[PDB]
Every structure is written in C-alpha cells, then in structure tokens.
Amino acid sequence: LDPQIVISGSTAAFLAIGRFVFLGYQRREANFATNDPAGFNIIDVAGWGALGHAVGFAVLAINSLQG
Amino acid sequence: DIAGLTPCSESKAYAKLEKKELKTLEKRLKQYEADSAPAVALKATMERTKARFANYAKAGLLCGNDGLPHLIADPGLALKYGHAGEVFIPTFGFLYVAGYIGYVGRQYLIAVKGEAKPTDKEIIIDVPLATKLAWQGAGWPLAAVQELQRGTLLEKEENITVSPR
Amino acid sequence: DVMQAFGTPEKQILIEPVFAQWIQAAHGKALYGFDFLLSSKTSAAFANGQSLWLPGWLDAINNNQNSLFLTIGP
Amino acid sequence: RQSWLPGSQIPAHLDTPAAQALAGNFGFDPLGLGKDPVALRWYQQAELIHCRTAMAGVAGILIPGLLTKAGALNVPEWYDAGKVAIENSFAPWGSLLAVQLFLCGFVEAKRWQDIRKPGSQGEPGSFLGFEASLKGTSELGYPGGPFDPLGLSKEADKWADWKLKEVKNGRLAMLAFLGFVAQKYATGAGPVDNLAAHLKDPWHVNYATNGVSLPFL
Amino acid sequence: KAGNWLPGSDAPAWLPDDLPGNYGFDPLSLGKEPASLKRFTESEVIHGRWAMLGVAGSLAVELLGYGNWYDAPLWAVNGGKATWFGIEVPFDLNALLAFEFVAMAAAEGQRGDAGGVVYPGGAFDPLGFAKDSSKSGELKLKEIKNGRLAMVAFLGFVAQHAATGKGPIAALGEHLANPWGANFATNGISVPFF
Amino acid sequence: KAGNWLPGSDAPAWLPDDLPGNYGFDPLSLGKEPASLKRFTESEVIHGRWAMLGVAGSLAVELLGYGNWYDAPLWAVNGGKATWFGIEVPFDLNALLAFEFVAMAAAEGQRGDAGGVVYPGGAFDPLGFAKDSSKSGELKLKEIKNGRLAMVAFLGFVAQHAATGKGPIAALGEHLANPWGANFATNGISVPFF
Amino acid sequence: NFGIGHRMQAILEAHTPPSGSLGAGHKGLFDTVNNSLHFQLGLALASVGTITSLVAQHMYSLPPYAFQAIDFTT
Ligand code: CLA
Ligand code: CLA
Ligand code: CLA
Ligand SMILES: CC1=C[C@H](O)CC(C)(C)[C@H]1/C=C/C(C)=C/C=C/C(C)=C/C=C/C=C(C)/C=C/C=C(C)/C=C/C1=C(C)C[C@H](O)CC1(C)C
Ligand SMILES: CC1=C[C@H](O)CC(C)(C)[C@H]1/C=C/C(C)=C/C=C/C(C)=C/C=C/C=C(C)/C=C/C=C(C)/C=C/C1=C(C)C[C@H](O)CC1(C)C
Ligand SMILES: CC1=C[C@H](O)CC(C)(C)[C@H]1/C=C/C(C)=C/C=C/C(C)=C/C=C/C=C(C)/C=C/C=C(C)/C=C/C1=C(C)C[C@H](O)CC1(C)C
Ligand SMILES: CC1=C[C@H](O)CC(C)(C)[C@H]1/C=C/C(C)=C/C=C\C(C)=C\C=C\C=C(C)\C=C\C=C(C)\C=C\C1=C(C)C[C@H](O)CC1(C)C
Ligand SMILES: CC1=C(/C=C/C(C)=C/C=C/C(C)=C/C=C\C=C(C)\C=C\C=C(C)\C=C\C2=C(C)C[C@@H](O)CC2(C)C)C(C)(C)CCC1
Ligand SMILES: CC1=C(/C=C/C(C)=C/C=C/C(C)=C/C=C/C=C(C)/C=C/C=C(C)/C=C/C2=C(C)CCCC2(C)C)C(C)(C)CCC1
Numbered sequence: 008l009d010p011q012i013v014i015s016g017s018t019a020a021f022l023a024i025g026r027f028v029f030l031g032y033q034r035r036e037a038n039f040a041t042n043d044p045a046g047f048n049i050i051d052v053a054g055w056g057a058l059g060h061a062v063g064f065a066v067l068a069i070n071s072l073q074g
Numbered sequence: 075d076i077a078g079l080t081p082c083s084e085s086k087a088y089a090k091l092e093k094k095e096l097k098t099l100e101k102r103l104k105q106y107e108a109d110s111a112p113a114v115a116l117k118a119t120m121e122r123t124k125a126r127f128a129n130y131a132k133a134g135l136l137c138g139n140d141g142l143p144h145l146i147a148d149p150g151l152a153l154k155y156g157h158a159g160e161v162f163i164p165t166f167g168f169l170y171v172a173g174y175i176g177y178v179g180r181q182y183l184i185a186v187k188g189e190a191k192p193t194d195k196e197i198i199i200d201v202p203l204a205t206k207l208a209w210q211g212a213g214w215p216l217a218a219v220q221e222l223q224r225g226t227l228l229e230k231e232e233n234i235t236v237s238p239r
Numbered sequence: 240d241v242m243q244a245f246g247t248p249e250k251q252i253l254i255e256p257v258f259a260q261w262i263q264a265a266h267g268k269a270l271y272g273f274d275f276l277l278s279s280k281t282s283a284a285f286a287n288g289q290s291l292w293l294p295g296w297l298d299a300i301n302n303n304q305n306s307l308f309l310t311i312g313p
Numbered sequence: 314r315q316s317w318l319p320g321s322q323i324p325a326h327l328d329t330p331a332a333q334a335l336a337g338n339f340g341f342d343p344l345g346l347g348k349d350p351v352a353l354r355w356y357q358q359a360e361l362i363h364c365r366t367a368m369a370g371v372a373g374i375l376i377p378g379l380l381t382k383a384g385a386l387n388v389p390e391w392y393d394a395g396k397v398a399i400e401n402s403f404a405p406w407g408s409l410l411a412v413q414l415f416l417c418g419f420v421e422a423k424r425w426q427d428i429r430k431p432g433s434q435g436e437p438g439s440f441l442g443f444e445a446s447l448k449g450t451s452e453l454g455y456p457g458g459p460f461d462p463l464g465l466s467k468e469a470d471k472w473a474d475w476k477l478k479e480v481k482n483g484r485l486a487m488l489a490f491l492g493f494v495a496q497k498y499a500t501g502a503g504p505v506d507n508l509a510a511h512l513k514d515p516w517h518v519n520y521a522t523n524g525v526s527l528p529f530l
Numbered sequence: 531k532a533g534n535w536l537p538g539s540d541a542p543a544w545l546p547d548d549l550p551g552n553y554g555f556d557p558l559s560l561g562k563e564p565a566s567l568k569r570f571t572e573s574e575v576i577h578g579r580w581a582m583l584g585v586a587g588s589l590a591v592e593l594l595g596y597g598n599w600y601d602a603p604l605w606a607v608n609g610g611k612a613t614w615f616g617i618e619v620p621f622d623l624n625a626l627l628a629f630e631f632v633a634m635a636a637a638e639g640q641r642g643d644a645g646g647v648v649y650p651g652g653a654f655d656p657l658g659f660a661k662d663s664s665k666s667g668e669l670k671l672k673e674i675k676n677g678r679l680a681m682v683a684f685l686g687f688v689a690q691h692a693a694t695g696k697g698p699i700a701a702l703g704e705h706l707a708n709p710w711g712a713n714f715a716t717n718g719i720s721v722p723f724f
Numbered sequence: 725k726a727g728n729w730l731p732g733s734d735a736p737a738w739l740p741d742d743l744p745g746n747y748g749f750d751p752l753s754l755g756k757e758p759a760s761l762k763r764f765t766e767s768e769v770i771h772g773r774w775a776m777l778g779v780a781g782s783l784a785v786e787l788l789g790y791g792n793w794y795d796a797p798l799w800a801v802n803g804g805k806a807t808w809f810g811i812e813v814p815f816d817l818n819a820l821l822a823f824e825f826v827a828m829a830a831a832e833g834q835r836g837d838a839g840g841v842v843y844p845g846g847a848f849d850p851l852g853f854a855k856d857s858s859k860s861g862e863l864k865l866k867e868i869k870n871g872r873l874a875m876v877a878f879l880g881f882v883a884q885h886a887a888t889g890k891g892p893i894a895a896l897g898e899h900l901a902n903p904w905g906a907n908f909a910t911n912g913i914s915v916p917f918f
Numbered sequence: 919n920f921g922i923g924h925r926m927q928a929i930l931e932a933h934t935p936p937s938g939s940l941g942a943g944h945k946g947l948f949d950t951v952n953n954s955l956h957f958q959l960g961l962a963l964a965s966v967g968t969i970t971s972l973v974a975q976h977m978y979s980l981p982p983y984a985f986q987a988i989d990f991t992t
Contacts, residue, residue, distance in 0.1 A: 016628070024631075024636070024639070028639035028640055032642065051922070054922055070624065076272075077255050078270055086251070092249075126247075126249070127249065142249050144255045145255065145311075146257065148257045154723075170291060199386055209343075209344075210343075210344050213345075217346070220349050220351075305987065306978050306980070339761045403710050405716060407716065407721060408711070408715040409710075410724070411713070411721070433537065435538075436538045439538070442759065442764060446752065458752065462752060565936065
C-alpha cells in the first residue's frame with residue numbers, strides 16, 4: 008500500500024460520497040459562502056476530508072501490521 | 075467435577091473430617107462406663123455422624139478442597155450432572171409452600187373484608203373459615219393462573235390511592 | 240455458624256459461585272474447567288488474539304499469586 | 314343427584330344445569346378448582362384428553378401383558394419396552410421424539426384453536442377441503458365427524474350413556490396408570506405379576522407388607 | 531388476504547388486506563403503528579430480495595464445485611487470491627472493501643433519499659412486468675413469499691453450518707442418505723438432552 | 725345413482741344423483757360441503773387415472789420379465805444403469821428427477837390453472853368418444869369404476885409386498901399353487917398370532 | 919458555530935418509542951437538564967462515583983505502577 012495512494016484515494020472517495028450522495032441527507036438532518044452549485048462549503052470539505060484521512064491511515068495501519 | 079470440585083466420595087479431606095469428628099466423640103466416650111447413659115448418647119451421635127457422611131457422599135454431592143459439600147445452583151449444570159436435589163427441586167418445593175401460605179392468607183383477607191367488622195376478624199381469627207381455606211390451598215397454583223387470566227388478581231389503578239406526585 | 244458451633248462443618252450451606260466462575264473461565268482462567276472462549280485453545284476468540292495481548296493476559300489470569308481474577312468459592 | 318360422598322354438601326358450581334350436563338358429575342371438587350365456569354370448561358377438556366390417553370396407554374400395558382403371561386405374546390414389561398424397541402429401531406429416540414412433537418403439536422394446535430373458538434378449524438380454504446370435516450360438534454371435546462367413523466354419536470337415545478362409560482372407564486384407566494407407576498417402584502415387578510402374587514397370598518402380599526407404602530406400621 | 535397463518539384466528543386490524551403477503555401474522559403486534567408498519571413493509575421486501583440473492587449464490591457456489599458459502603472468504607485470511615467461476619480475481623480485500631463501500635454507499639444512499647419506494651420500476655423493471663395492476667398483486671405476493679422462504683433458508687444455512695460444519699448441499703446429502711439418523715435431533719447441539 | 729354401496733342405507737343428499745360413481749358412499753360426511761365435494765371429485769378421477777396407469781405398468785414389467793414394480797428403482801440406488809424394455813436408458817437419477825420435476829410442474833401447472841377441469845377434450849379426447857353426453861355418462865362411470873378398482877389394486881400390491889416381499893404376479897402364482905396355504909391369513913403379518 | 923454537528927435538544931426530542939411505552943420520551947429533558955445545576959451535579963456525582971469504584975477495582979487487579987503490588991499496605 009503506497010501511503011500517498013491510500014490516503015489520496017480515501018479522501019477523494021469520502022469527499023465524493025459527501026458531495027453527490029449524503030449531501031441532501033446531511034442538509035435535511037442539519038435542518039462560509041460556497042460558489043459550489045450544490046453549496047458544498049469548506050467546513051463540509053474539512054469534515055468528509057477528515058473522515059477520508061482517518062479511514063486511509065486505518066487501512067495503512069492494519070496493512071503495516073501485515074494482516 | 076464442575077468448578078474443579080471433587081466428589082465427596084473421592085475427597086481425602088472429606089474422609090479426614092469424618093475421622094476427626096468421630097475421634098472427638100470417641101475421646102469423650104472413654105471417660106464413661108459402657109452401659110452408662112452418657113456412653114449410649116455418644117454412641118448414637120457417632121452412628122448419626124457415620125450415616126451423614128455416607129448419605130451425603132451417596133447423594134453425589136461435590137466437595138471443595140476444604141472437604142466440605144458444595145451446592146450447584148445452575149439449573150443447567152444441576153440437571154446435566156445429577157445435582158438437582160441440591161437447589162432446583164428445593165426451589166419448587168419452597169415456592170409451592172410459600173405460595174400456599176400467601177394464597178390462603180389473601181383468600182382469608184378477601185373473605186373477612188365483606189363482613190361487618192373486618193378488623194375484628196383479623197384480631198379474632200375466624201377459625202372454621204381459616205381451616206377451610208387452609209385445606210383448599212393445595213390447588214393454589216392453578217387458582218392463581220385462573221385469577222391471572224380472568225384479570226381478577228390485580229386491582230385497577232383508578233381504585234388505588236397514591237401521593238400528589 | 241450453628242453448623243460450625245455444633246461441630247458439623249459438612250452440614251453448612253455452601254453455594255458455589257458458578258456464574259462468576261463461568262465468567263472467569265470465559266476470561267481465560269482454566270481452574271474451573273469450563274473450557275470456553277479464552278479458556279478454550281480451539282476457540283476463535285482464543286486464536287484471533289493469540290498474536291496480540293492474550294499470551295501475556297492468559298499468563299497473568301492463570302497466575303494465582305497476583306490479584307488478576309482471584310479464585311472464588313462459597 | 315349421585316354424590317361421591319352421600320350427605321356431603323355439593324358445590325353450587327357443580328349443581329348448575331350446565332355443570333350437570335357434564336358426564337361424570339358426581340359433585341366432586343373439594344378444592345374448588347372449577348368454581349370459575351371458564352376454568353371448568355378447560356378442565357373438562359383436560360379431563361377428557363387425560364381419560365382417552367390413559368385408556369389407550371393402559372390397554373397397551375395390560376392387554377399385551379396378559380397375552381404375554383399366557384404366551385400369545387412376548388412383549389417386554391412396560392417399563393423396559395422403550396429400551397427394547399429403540400434397540401433395533403430405524404431411528405434414535407431423540408429423532409423419534411422430535412418427529413412426534415412436530416406431528417402432535419400440529420394436531421394439538423388445531424384442537425387448541427377449536428377450544429378458543431369452537432368450529433374455527435372449519436375456516437373455508439384452510440385445509441384443502443378437509444376443514445369442513447375439521448369442524449367438531451355442538452359439544453366441545455366430542456369432535457365426531459371423521460373421529461366417529463361408525464356414527465355411534467348419531468343416536469341421541471344412547472349419547473349420554475356412551476359419554477358416562479368413556480369418563481368412568483377413563484378415570485379408572487388414569488388411576489390404573491398411577492397404580493402401575495407406584496407398584497413398579499414399591500415391588501420391582503410388573504402389574505400382571507403383582508396381581509398373581511397378591512392372588513396367591515392376599516393376606517400377606519399387599520401394600521401393607523411391601524415395606525414402602527406404610528413406613529410407620 | 532393471502533391466507534390465515536393460524537386457521538380460524540382473527541387477522542389483526544392494523545394489517546391492510548391489500549398489503550402484499552398478509553396472512554394475519556403479527557402476534558407481537560410489532561406493526562400496530564402505521565409508520566412502523568410502513569418501514570417494516572419496505573424492510574421485509576429488502577431483506578427478502580437480499581436473502582434470495584444470498585441463498586441463490588450460496589447454492590450456486592457449492593453446486594458448481596467452488597466450495598460452500600462459508601469457506602468463500604477464507605482466501606483473504608489464508609493469503610490466497612480471489613476466484614469467481616474459477617477465474618482468478620486481481621483485487622484484494624483492501625480493494626474489495628473500498629469498491630463495495632463506495633458502490634453500496636452510492637446505491638443505498640440514492641434509494642434512501644427516494645423514500646420508502648419499495649417497488650421503484652422504470653429502469654429496474656425493464657421487461658415491463660408490473661406495468662399494470664392486475665399482474666402486480668400476484669407478482670408482489672410471489673416476491674414476498676419467495677423472499678420469506680429465502681430468509682428462512684439462509685437462517686437454516688447458518689444454523690445448520692454452526693452445528694454440523696457442512697455446506698447446505700452436503701447436509702442435504704447426509705439427510706437423504708440417513709433421514710432418521712442425520713437431522714437436527716442427531717447433531718448433539720440443537721437439543722442438548724436428545 | 726350407480727347403486728347402493730350398503731343395501732338398506734339411504735344415500736347422502738349432498739351427493740348429486742348425476743355425480744358419476746354415486747353409490748351413496750360418504751359415511752364420514754366429507755363431501756357434505758359443495759366446495760369440498762368439488763375438489764374431492766376431481767382428485768378422485770386424477771387418482772384413478774394415475775393408478776390405472778401404475779397398475780398396468782406394474783403388471784406389464786413383471787409379465788414381460790423385466791422385474792417387479794418394487795425393484796424397478798434399485799438400479800439408481802446401486803451402480804446399475806437404467807433399462808426400459810431391455811433397451812438401456814442413459815440417465816442418472818439426478819437427470820430423471822430434474823426432467824420429471826420440470827415436465828410435471830409444467831403440465832400440472834396448466835391443469836391446475838385451468839380450474840378443476842376433470843374432463844377436457846380435443847387433445848385429451850381425440851377419437852371422439854365423449855362428444856355425445858349419452859355415451860359420456862356411461863363412459864365416465866366406467867372410468868371411475870376402473871380407476872377405483874385400480875386404486876384398490878395398487879394398495880393391494882403395496883400391502884402384499886409389505887407382508888410377503890414378492891411381486892404381484894409372483895403372489896398370484898403362489899396363491900394359485902396353494903390357495904389354502906398361500907393367503908393373507910398365512911403370512912404371519914395380516915392376521916396376528918397363529 | 920460552523921453549520922455541522924448535532925443539537926442535543928433535537929436528539930432528545932427524537933428519542934420517543936413509537937408505541938408510547940415511554941410517553942413523550944425525552945421531550946423537555948434538554949431544558950430540564952440545562953436549567954438544573956442540581957440535575958447536572960447529580961449526574962456528575964453518579965458518574966464520577968461509579969468511575970471512582972472502577973479505579974479501585976482496576977488499580978488493585980491490574981496494578982499500573984511498578985512495585986505497587988508488593989507494597990501490600992499501599
Ligand atoms: C439466572 C442466571 C443464570 C446464569 C448466570 C446462568 C449461566 C449459565 N447457564 Mg443457565 N439457566 C438459568 C439461569 C442462569 N444460567 C435458568 C433460570 C435456567 C432454567 C431454564 C437455566 C438453564 C440452563 C441450561 C439448560 C444450561 C444452562 C447453562 C449455563 C452456563 C452456560 C450457559 C450460557 O451459555 O450462557 C448463560 C445462560 C443464561 C444467561 C440463561 C440460561 C442458560 C441458557 C438458556 C442455556 C444455553 C446453554 C448453551 C447450550 C451453552 C452451553 C453449551 C454446552 C456446554 C451445553 C452458564 C454458566 C448451560 C450449561 O452450562 O449446562 C452444562 C446449559 O445448557 N442454564
Ligand atoms: C396474606 C398475607 C400476606 C401476603 C399474601 C403478602 C404478600 C406480599 N407482601 Mg407482605 N406482609 C404481610 C403479609 C402478607 N404479605 C404481613 C403480616 C406483614 C407484616 C410483617 C407484611 C410485610 C411486608 C413487607 C415489609 C413487604 C411485604 C411485601 C409483599 C409482596 C412481595 C412478596 C413478599 O411476600 O414479600 C415478603 C413478605 C414478608 C416477608 C412478610 C411475611 C408475612 C407472613 C409470612 C404472612 C402471614 C400472613 C398471615 C399471618 C396469614 C393469615 C392466614 C389466615 C388463614 C389467618 C407481596 C405481594 C414486600 C413488597 O411490598 O414487595 C412489593 C415488602 O416489602 N410484606
Ligand atoms: C384419494 C382417493 C379418493 C378420493 C379423493 C375420493 C373421493 C370421493 N369418493 Mg371415492 N373411492 C376411492 C377413492 C377416493 N375417493 C377408492 C379407492 C374407492 C374404492 C374402494 C372408492 C369408492 C367410492 C364409492 C363407492 C363412492 C365414492 C364416493 C366419493 C365422493 C364422495 C365424497 C366423499 O366421499 O368425500 C371425500 C372423499 C375423500 C376425501 C377421500 C380422501 C381420502 C381419505 C379421506 C383420506 C384417508 C383415507 C384412508 C387412508 C382410508 C383409505 C382406505 C384404506 C384401506 C387405506 C368423493 C368425491 C361416493 C360418490 O358419490 O362418488 C361419486 C361413492 O359412492 N368413492
Ligand atoms: C378431580 C379433583 C378435584 C378436587 O378439587 C382435587 C383433587 C382431588 C386434587 C382432583 C383429583 C385429581 C386426580 C385424582 C387426578 C389424577 C390424575 C391421574 C392419575 C392422571 C393419569 C394420567 C395417565 C395417563 C395420561 C397415562 C398415559 C400412559 C401412556 C400414554 C402409556 C405410555 C406407554 C405404554 C402404552 C407402554 C410403553 O411400554 C411404555 C409407555 C411409553 C409408558
Ligand atoms: C414477522 C413477525 C411479527 C410477529 O409479531 C413476531 C415475530 C415472530 C418476531 C416476527 C417474525 C420475525 C422473523 C421470523 C424474522 C426473520 C428474519 C430473517 C430469517 C431474516 C434473514 C435475512 C437473511 C438475509 C437478508 C441474507 C443475506 C445474504 C446475502 C446478502 C449474501 C450472503 C453471501 C453469499 C451470496 C455467499 C458468500 O460466500 C458469502 C455471503 C457474503 C454470506
Ligand atoms: C425486477 C426485474 C425487472 C425485469 O423487467 C424482469 C426481471 C429481470 C425478471 C426482474 C428481475 C428479477 C430477479 C433478479 C429475480 C431473482 C429471483 C431469485 C434469485 C429468487 C431466489 C429465490 C430462492 C429461494 C426461494 C430459496 C429457497 C431455498 C430453500 C427452500 C432451501 C432449502 C434447503 C435448506 C434451507 C438447507 C439444506 O441443507 C439444503 C436445502 C434443501 C437446499
Ligand atoms: C370415499 C370415502 C368417503 C367416506 O366418507 C369415508 C372414507 C372411507 C374415509 C373415504 C375413502 C377414501 C378411500 C377408500 C381412499 C382409498 C384408497 C386408495 C388406494 C387410493 C390410492 C390411489 C393410488 C394411486 C393413485 C397409485 C398410483 C401409482 C402410480 C401413478 C405409479 C406407480 C409405479 C409404476 C407405474 C411402476 C414403477 O416401477 C414404480 C411406480 C412409480 C411406483
Ligand atoms: C400467586 C401467589 C402470589 C404472587 C403474586 C405476584 C403478582 C407475583 C409477581 C411475580 C412477578 C411480577 C415476577 C416478575 C419477574 C420474575 C422473573 C423475571 C423470574 C425470575 C426467576 C429466575 C430468573 C430463576 C432463577 C433460578 C431458578 C430456575 C430456580 C432456582 O434454581 C434458583 C435460580 C435463581 C437458579 C401472592 C399473591 C404473592 C401469594 C402467594 C401466591
Ligand atoms: C472546488 C471544486 C473542485 C474540487 C476541488 C478539490 C480537489 C477539493 C479537495 C479538497 C481536499 C484536499 C480536501 C481534503 C481534506 C482532508 C482533511 C481535512 C484531512 C484531515 C486529517 C485528519 C482529521 C487526521 C487526523 C488524525 C491524525 C492527525 C493522527 C492519526 C489519526 C488521524 C488520521 C485520525 C471540483 C474540481 C470537483 C469542481 C470544481 C471546483
């Protein structure tokens with residue numbers, strides 16, 4: 008597992024799922040101006056981006072344990 | 075067997091305890107003449123001791139390292155390993171007797187409540203009625219289920235007093 | 240107390256703490272012979288943690304000189 | 314009114330016309346178990362099933378036993394027959410009991426639902442056309458229909474007598490089974506031996522001389 | 531109503547007769563509230579559809595001689611390689627987990643927003659079976675009944691494996707070979723005292 | 725009424741006079757409900773038609789020295805191959821089971837969906853025969869009587885084999901050889917004791 | 919302050935069993951807890967007190983400090 012590849016891919020995946028899948032649900036649950044059409048503000052990026060980093064490091068961490 | 079315990083029948087500590095107990099009784103039986111009433115009494119206690127150690131072992135009781143019988147209370151272990159006369163069966167025996175007392179007493183209170191002076195029937199016991207209920211209490215378990223199913227066992231909350239809250 | 244006073248300690252009620260001993264067995268203690276979970280070397284819970292903490296834990300929980308899950312009785 | 318105890322006070326719940334319509338009503342309920350009508354109905358069903366099971370079982374212990382005593386049969390004693398039968402069976406006892414509970418539970422559930430609501434098992438379209446026959450009669454515990462192949466229940470001038478013989482023979486067979494259990498534990502022999510032994514010396518061979526029934530005398 | 535689960539019993543009032551697969555079975559009255567029933571109706575259909583795929587897959591793998599549903603993922607904990615209909619799969623657990631998570635997150639997410647839509651149709655009904663209403667009732671009943679049977683089968687697959695350690699087809703083989711000697715009552719686990 | 729099964733008995737009113745094979749025999753009152761009688765009527769004809777083919781082929785095989793009905797499937801249980809009229813048939817049990825299941829489910833499904841049609845026509849009635857009702861009635865009585873006879877015959881074959889373990893023709897030979905020595909009462913099974 | 923996160927009042931208000939087994943559920947509890955220092959102190963004491971007993975049970979069974987288990991008095 009290439010550290011740069013795992014994390015990079017992980018962050019992108021969460022940013023995508025949070026921008027095209029759960030954005031509506033989160034907004035509905037929610038009941039920083041962004042020119043993004045779907046209104047994806049920076050704080051939203053920070054959140055999903057963080058999730059991605061965590062998941063990425065987890066994969067690398069367990070992989071480093073070799074199994 | 076269970077919990078690392080050992081049958082009293084195969085415990086060495088169980089055997090040593092029985093010898094220790096009989097040796098105390100024997101050290102005392104000496105100071106008395108053979109037919110003396112004291113001697114007869116110490117002998118009957120020695121016989122009762124021998125029967126107890128034998129009866130307990132035959133019942134298949136398990137003994138700890140202390141050489142003393144331990145009781146198995148898990149329904150699963152007791153039934154699968156022959157230890158149900160230790161806690162399980164006793165439980166249903168007591169529950170029957172205790173419910174018997176409770177159901178009869180409840181039946182008495184209900185009967186005297188419809189009288190002129192219930193308080194008087196609580197200080198002076200209506201013996202005939204009490205004896206009748208005492209005999210009819212043998213079938214309490216079925217009566218208690220039949221009352222539970224008719225909804226006559228409990229009282230409506232609307233009729234029970236409570237504090238302001 | 241009465242059974243001890245009348246010199247009949249074999250007549251005392253001594254209920255074994257089987258439910259607690261079963262938990263201790265589950266945690267690894269084999270003194271009770273329940274053989275399950277961490278007390279069973281063929282259990283998955285045993286195999287999964289064999290390369291992690293179990294080894295050190297099992298050595299300690301099976302040592303009767305520390306205070307880790309002391310032996311219990313009536 | 315026939316009484317289990319001449320001169321005793323019959324419970325009013327057993328003197329009610331519906332209770333008197335019940336077969337075997339000799340006014341016997343000293344513990345007052347059937348005071349509640351709804352319970353009396355469940356207990357009447359329970360007594361009928363116990364009577365019909367005990368009659369079948371006791372017939373399956375005495376009849377084979379007498380025939381074996383004669384020679385016409387070589388059946389083992391009732392208390393040893395399970396081991397003998399399972400010894401050469403196609404299935405272990407556990408598998409045989411599992412199949413028993415499935416088949417008994419099904420027919421017991423249908424009978425149960427018929428007690429909860431009589432005639433319910435005739436629910437149209439519930440049993441491939443057999444539900445029509447699964448409806449019992451106007452009397453609970455007396456299904457008739459396929460259960461009365463010879464139509465003896467159709468003779469109203471003989472109905473009461475037939476039900477009284479069933480209840481009295483059933484109550485006797487229930488006590489005969491309890492006797493078979495008690496005598497087995499007190500003798501170590503079978504019911505046919507116990508009978509022959511007593512008949513040989515009735516004054517010295519009885520429960521008073523068994524060394525168990527009367528531990529005081 | 532599809533029928534009665536307990537002949538001669540009264541069907542609960544909360545269960546609509548139009549509800550596909552109504553046999554009056556709600557003894558716990560879990561569906562006595564309408565909103566709870568609406569979720570339970572979508573979840574039964576969803577569970578049934580997964581179960582049917584699962585049981586079909588569980589049977590196929592063994593019937594095609596590729597092992598049983600239980601030993602399928604061992605290659606990951608055995609340091610091997612993925613295999614499908616024999617073909618070796620180039621991805622590994624890490625890749626499988628990622629692809630799936632993204633795929634399932636997208637699909638389920640899309641379905642969740644659509645609401646309780648149980649029968650989507652359109653792109654999901656290409657051959658146009660449930661276009662009308664007359665065919666619908668029976669086809670939805672067949673779907674709910676086959677889903678209920680598959681859910682029970684899968685449960686059976688797990689329970690039987692846990693007690694015997696054999697695959698469904700291998701267990702059928704033993705039961706057919708010795709019906710009275712090879713069943714749950716002979717396992718030594720289902721009934722402890724049997 | 726084709727007759728009275730029990731002379732001196734009155735026929736159950738629920739049994740229609742035209743009902744083919746109406747000998748007034750419903751002692752347990754099973755056909756009392758019209759719906760039930762309808763299903764039982766169709767089932768009785770189906771049972772008779774199947775049995776009339778079973779008895780035929782059960783006697784034919786033995787008469788043609790190809791074995792008895794009971795030993796016909798043992799080839800599958802052993803390593804033996806399948807034969808028919810001596811000619812060998814190349815199929816394992818599994819193939820036969822699947823082929824029959826699909827074939828039966830198909831034809832039986834069409835019959836079932838039809839709606840209890842006991843007497844179809846055209847393909848099932850070439851060679852005319854049932855075009856005139858006058859002939860139809862007697863022909864329907866002959867079918868039910870021959871079918872009922874064949875149903876009692878098959879049960880006899882199964883019972884005889886269960887008590888003697890021999891083929892139906894082989895029994896007929898044993899009985900004809902010694903009628904008073906070879907009969908149900910001389911098998912040690914039908915009549916106890918002796 | 920950033921548009922993301924949970925509103926405790928919304929969480930509590932949503933936790934109401936649909937069958938009415940808990941009445942209005944946790945409705946009004948946000949304000950009940952937020953406006954009652956005694957309610958807040960009751961929870962803190964109940965939690966800290968249970969945690970204090972855990973410290974006692976875990977420190978003796980799993981001694982975290984070197985040469986602590988040999989110091990019986992300590
Ligand atoms: C009330 C508290 C209590 C507690 C703490 C236990 C604890 C225990 N029971 Mg149990 N039991 C209880 C009440 C309790 N029982 C009651 C009221 C009954 C009457 C029905 C039983 C009937 C019972 C049976 C029949 C069995 C146990 C058994 C056991 C032991 C293992 C059971 C298990 O896996 O989880 C704990 C169990 C419970 C929390 C509740 C009941 C026990 C379940 C229902 C039995 C399932 C056991 C299962 C087969 C696991 C063991 C596998 C194998 C060794 C048999 C365990 C130490 C098993 C055993 O060890 O037998 C040798 C056994 O088979 N119990
Ligand atoms: C008809 C008699 C009777 C009955 C049916 C009950 C029933 C009950 N009592 Mg109770 N009680 C009784 C008498 C009775 N009590 C008396 C006389 C006292 C004064 C000591 C109490 C004091 C008492 C307390 C303090 C408590 C109960 C509680 C309870 C409930 C819990 C179970 C329990 O028994 O706990 C145990 C009850 C006892 C140990 C009291 C023993 C009373 C004796 C054994 C009963 C004898 C009654 C009478 C002499 C018999 C008359 C017979 C008649 C023919 C003349 C239960 C419903 C507990 C409860 O509320 O739980 C919800 C509870 O805390 N009771
Ligand atoms: C599955 C086979 C079958 C079925 C469905 C029927 C159905 C029917 N028969 Mg029939 N019958 C049969 C076999 C069958 N029969 C055989 C083999 C014989 C030759 C002995 C006869 C002789 C016969 C006569 C003489 C008459 C009927 C009549 C009838 C009709 C009257 C309604 C009725 O009796 O209730 C419904 C019937 C059933 C539900 C049969 C189902 C099978 C039973 C109920 C299950 C258990 C049977 C049990 C094992 C006993 C079997 C015999 C035993 C030795 C094994 C009915 C539609 C009467 C009629 O009017 O016909 C037009 C009538 O006159 N049958
Ligand atoms: C009424 C009254 C009222 C008031 O109030 C009170 C009082 C008095 C309480 C009451 C009384 C009561 C009584 C008396 C009761 C009794 C009961 C019984 C005995 C039952 C049995 C019951 C019994 C029964 C069922 C039985 C059954 C049996 C059977 C199945 C059999 C089986 C078998 C056989 C064949 C043989 C083999 O080899 C074995 C076996 C397996 C064993
Ligand atoms: C209704 C009611 C009401 C009343 O009131 C009461 C009561 C009774 C409570 C109730 C009932 C309930 C019930 C019965 C339930 C059941 C459930 C189930 C069984 C499910 C399953 C469920 C199941 C399911 C889904 C399944 C799934 C599966 C899947 C996806 C897949 C899988 C797989 C495969 C392919 C193969 C591989 O190699 C492996 C795997 C990966 C493993
Ligand atoms: C929507 C759409 C649209 C368009 O337009 C059209 C189309 C395309 C047509 C459609 C689609 C559809 C689909 C996909 C379907 C699927 C289905 C399935 C798979 C089912 C299963 C289904 C399945 C099922 C039921 C299952 C069943 C099972 C069972 C019973 C089991 C049995 C058993 C057990 C337990 C165990 C043992 O050991 C063995 C055995 C014996 C084996
Ligand atoms: C009506 C009535 C009414 C009133 O109510 C009363 C009562 C009496 C209840 C009733 C009655 C009923 C009855 C009697 C029934 C009977 C009988 C029978 C036998 C049936 C069968 C029936 C039978 C049948 C179908 C059969 C069939 C058969 C088949 C297909 C086939 C076979 C075979 C062959 C070819 C050859 C090979 O190698 C093998 C096999 C494959 C094996
Ligand atoms: C009928 C009767 C009475 C009783 C009245 C009432 C309402 C009693 C209430 C009972 C209630 C509400 C019980 C509620 C829950 C009880 C539960 C959950 C049962 C717990 C028992 C367990 C877990 C069994 C434990 C074990 C078993 C198998 C037996 C032993 O082996 C010991 C042990 C612990 C291992 C009246 C009036 C007091 C008067 C009198 C007679
Ligand atoms: C705008 C736009 C776009 C896009 C762009 C981009 C590219 C974005 C991205 C951005 C990004 C790039 C994001 C990211 C984020 C991330 C983050 C925010 C992270 C964080 C981290 C964390 C939180 C961690 C933590 C921790 C540590 C520290 C230690 C260990 C453990 C852990 C890991 C947990 C497009 C073209 C589409 C369209 C148009 C416009």
